[PDB]
Amino acid sequence: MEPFKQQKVEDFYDIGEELGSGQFAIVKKCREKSTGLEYAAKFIKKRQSRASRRGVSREEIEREVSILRQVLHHNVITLHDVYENRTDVVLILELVSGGELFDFLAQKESLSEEEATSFIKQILDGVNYLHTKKIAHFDLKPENIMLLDKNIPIPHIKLIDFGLAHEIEDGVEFKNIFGTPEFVAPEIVNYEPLGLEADMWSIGVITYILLSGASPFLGDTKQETLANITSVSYDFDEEFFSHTSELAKDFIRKLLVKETRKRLTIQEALRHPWITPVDNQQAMVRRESVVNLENFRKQYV
Numbered sequence: 001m002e003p004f005k006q007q008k009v010e011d012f013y014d015i016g017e018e019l020g021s022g023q024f025a026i027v028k029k030c031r032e033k034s035t036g037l038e039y040a041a042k043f044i045k046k047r048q049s050r051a052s053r054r055g056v057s058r059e060e061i062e063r064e065v066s067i068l069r070q071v072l073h074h075n076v077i078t079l080h081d082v083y084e085n086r087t088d089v090v091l092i093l094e095l096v097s098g099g100e101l102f103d104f105l106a107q108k109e110s111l112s113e114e115e116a117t118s119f120i121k122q123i124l125d126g127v128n129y130l131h132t133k134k135i136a137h138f139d140l141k142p143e144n145i146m147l148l149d150k151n152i153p154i155p156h157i158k159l160i161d162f163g164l165a166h167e168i169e170d171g172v173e174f175k176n177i178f179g180t181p182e183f184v185a186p187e188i189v190n191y192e193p194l195g196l197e198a199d200m201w202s203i204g205v206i207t208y209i210l211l212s213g214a215s216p217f218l219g220d221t222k223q224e225t226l227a228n229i230t231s232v233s234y235d236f237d238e239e240f241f242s243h244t245s246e247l248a249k250d251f252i253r254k255l256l257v258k259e260t261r262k263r264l265t266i267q268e269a270l271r272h273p274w275i276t277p278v279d280n281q282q283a284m285v286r287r288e289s290v291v292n293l294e295n296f297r298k299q300y301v
């Protein structure tokens with residue numbers, strides 16, 4: 001098991017602007033002095049003991065690193081190196097400086113469902129690689145779908161933040177409560193057995209929001225949000241879904257299913273007609289169907 005470098009990160013990197021933060025990790029933009037190449041440095045604060053309200057445990061850091069070290073894919077963030085001092089364990093990761101997918105979408109003059117499925121298909125490709133390796137992401141949500149270079153015509157998506165990711169064991173049961181309520185599967189809220197299926201639910205939510213601007217199960221309070229999810233109470237309200245094709249809806253509807261066995265696995269979602277058209281007729285429908293960008297820009301900004 002590769003050991004973490006014990007040197008001071010600042011002796012090897014020039015630390016720069018803050019890229020983001022969140023709970024127990026601050027991500028700063030850095031540059032290695034020897035090579036001159038740029039990266040992003042994720043400082044994870046370690047726990048003091050175990051009750052300790054501040055910090056992440058050793059296991060959960062070692063899990064994340066273990067998982068990150070396995071993954072080399074074009075739609076997934078790649079690890080460069082790991083450092084450690086007395087307070088923080090610092091992950092030096094690929095620099096993805098294109099911002100969030102949704103921020104880029106929110107600036108477009110127009111967006112067809114074909115253009116939409118391009119970006120969704122990248123997310124699917126990435127999740128397929130993970131799932132083939134029996135790795136659940138468990139935190140798929142818009143702010144975790146980043147872009148490399150927004151200045152190109154079709155930006156390239158990179159999945160980030162594997163802090164809740166987990167290797168799925170055959171025969172072993174895994175239950176936990178985590179994630180952002182708005183995007184979590186029913187099995188998470190119910191504290192029922194989890195697996196690869198939860199990611200597919202969250203792709204459903206992501207697609208629902210991407211096409212419409214509205215969130216499927218979001219309530220006025222966390223309570224309401226959780227009750228909507230558990231009953232699977234959403235609709236395709238024509239105020240948001242008048243421009244939306246039947247196939248787009250079929251896709252979302254087969255993902256947002258309570259029964260984990262009946263939900264689409266990743267390989268099925270890649271092969272869905274909305275992602276992979278079977279004839280040239282349905283390819284035209286997708287190219288002609290538009291997304292309502294103002295509904296989207298309103299619920300974003």
Ligand SMILES: NCCNS(=O)(=O)c1cccc2cnccc12
Nearest residue numbers: 019020021022027040095096160
């Ligand atoms: N707490 C999440 C902070 N998100 S973030 O700073 O944008 C961010 C998080 C993780 C990896 C990144 C790689 N490159 C740029 C930014 C990155």
